[PDB]
């Protein structure tokens, strides 16, 4: 849909938390392994994300994720308001499992899975589609 | 110059290390605050960066930064080889100083400075130029 929409959710693996951001229009992913599911971690992740892409609106499958004072502060400062996402998360979880034995740390496997996901042609890749969608929206 | 060239360097502030990546052709920046200047931190940062952008070659002002087994492993797996950068780092350091009192954590000020830097029109911004350069290179 719109090029400024991102969906953010956390998933749990090996007793750790993976924050996954999906650019809904392209299927492109950004992810980080965080110690715990806290408002401060979500707020910091949003500031990083908003500095890289033109983030207009955020969606989530857990609304209570965005109630903290810290998350509201990050969205205020950055000027952020509010099958694809389910499929992109499914694909990422599958890829982590496929590459997991190749690294010691879960965070390393997660970044290998993000790379594989973003570079896979579906014909363009999610990495190619996001830059095309954003560049076209500017011009 | 070429759209796949990035320059990576560390800078020191308040007893912490900031890893700064500059996309040479656009002036776009990605940065993270790391505990210490280690090969494992550089390797992990490179895996994240390479998953987001088409990273072909890496430059640095300190060649010894890339000698560790971990950095060479990240470049091998991701298929990475090897006034603008000086100006982009100068501007970032100036912006951190300007916004520093607005946040408790240096990492928060750093991400606010990256956002401000990438969104500032110079007429396009570094954030707009990187997506235009990469989208044009694909098509
Ligand atoms: C933790 C870690 N160590 C690594 C390496 C590579 C060498 N070493 C040293 C080493 C030496 C002897 C060993 F017996 C041993 F098991 C590992 C990667 C690493 C770095 C980059 C990378 C990959 C690996 C495995 C896999 C493909 C994608 O890119 C690691 C790695 O951790 C950091 C990325 C944090 C450095 C990991 O989680 O295994
Ligand atoms: C650590 C931190 N705490 C924050 C907040 C916001 C509210 N609080 C709670 C709070 C309550 C009462 C206070 F007296 C007090 F000082 C702070 C930001 C924060 C979050 C987002 C953000 C900004 C701030 C200050 C500045 C503009 C860009 O976006 C922080 C913040 O740390 C995290 C980003 C890790 C949450 C910080 O470093 O100050
Ligand atoms: C996004 As979950 C905390
Ligand atoms: C709080 As968010 C939009
Ligand atoms: C890039 As410095 C360690
Ligand atoms: C080691 As790097 C190219």
Author numbering:
A (entry chain A), B (entry chain A): 56 to 137, 149 to 188, 193 to 209
What do the study's own words say?
During the early steps of HIV infection, IN catalyzes the initial covalent attachment of the viral cDNA to host cell nuclear DNA. The catalytic core domain (residues 50–212) adopts an RNase H superfamily fold and contains a D,D-35-E motif that binds Mg2+ or Mn2+ ions, which mediate DNA cleaving and joining. An additional class of IN inhibitors, the allosteric inhibitors of integrase (ALLINIs), act at a second site on HIV IN.
Substitutions at residue 124 could affect ALLINI binding or the catalytic core domain–CTD interaction. Overlay of the catalytic core domain•GSK002 structures on the IN•GSK1264 structure suggests a further mechanism of resistance. Larger substitutions at residue 124 and 125 would create a steric clash with the polypeptide backbone of the IN CTD, disrupting the inhibitor-mediated interaction.
